């Protein structure tokens, strides 16, 4: 065999997968603060788009320029209804996803406490 150790720092793409490595070359996972923008990395390091559970509540990490000229994958200050394909969500005044039983515009809904996706039908 032949092997060489390298170092990756910062915002990095391999093919269509986006990673963040910190100063020490160490890959980052989960809910991550990069210079005060918040991001979500899967358990395999790969940056995710969609709604994920954080200490701060369920947040929407979105493609660049979804709202307020946000960065690829950043948490955004979304409010209202959101459809991400077959999955539906509702974001509060506090920019987190609603969970449990809620009345929205005079109709009752239920959103799964574990995913925040609307439970329909």
């Amino acid at each position, epitope marked *: 065999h032949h092997h060489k150790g390298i170092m990756r720092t*910062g*915002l990095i*793409s391999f093919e269509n997968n*986006n990673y963040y490595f910190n100063e020490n070359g160490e890959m980052q996972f989960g809910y991550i603060n990069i*210079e*005060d923008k918040m991001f979500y990395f899967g358990e395999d390091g790969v940056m995710q788009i969609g709604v994920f559970n954080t200490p701060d509540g369920f947040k929407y990490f979105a493609h660049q320029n979804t709202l307020d*000229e*946000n*960065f690829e994958g950043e948490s955004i200050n979304y409010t209202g209804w959101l459809d991400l394909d077959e999955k539906r969500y509702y974001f509060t005044d506090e920019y987190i996803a609603a969970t449990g039983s809620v009345i929205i515009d005079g109709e009752e809904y239920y959103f799964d406490p574990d995913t925040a996706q609307l439970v329909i039908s």
Partner: nanobody
């Protein structure tokens, strides 16, 4: 409506120095990763240097240690300090602003300057 203006370009002797300036209007400047690319006639446009919204810089291999990028978020301006200049550094230099993931890549940028000529003589 969105404009990036280069300046500070022009002619310089080898081993000498230049400071490229890019002035941004038409966007929330503090939100973009700002970058510099270069194209020398005969060559493809290549990444040069980039800077995060929080000021963390990164550089192509061949300018590392010689160039220094920086940003003034209060003036909507970014700077490329070019030291120890070489004939290899001769190119049109373009500033760009972007929201895409990897700094090193032309497609990570959505806004582009007109470019300014940097000529270096032996």
């Amino acid at each position: 409506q969105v404009q990036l203006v280069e300046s500070g370009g022009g002619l310089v002797q080898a081993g000498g120095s230049l400071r490229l300036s890019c002035a941004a209007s038409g966007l929330t400047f503090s939100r973009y990763v700002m970058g510099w690319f270069r194209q020398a006639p005969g060559k493809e446009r290549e990444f040069v240097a980039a800077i995060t919204w929080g000021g963390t810089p990164n550089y192509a291999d061949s300018v590392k240690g010689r160039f220094t990028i920086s940003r003034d978020n209060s003036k909507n301006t970014q700077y490329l300090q070019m030291n120890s200049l070489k004939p290899e550094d001769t190119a049109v230099y373009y500033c760009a602003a972007g929201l895409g993931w990897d700094s090193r890549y032309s497609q990570s940028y959505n806004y582009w300057g007109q470019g300014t000529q940097v000529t270096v003589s032996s």
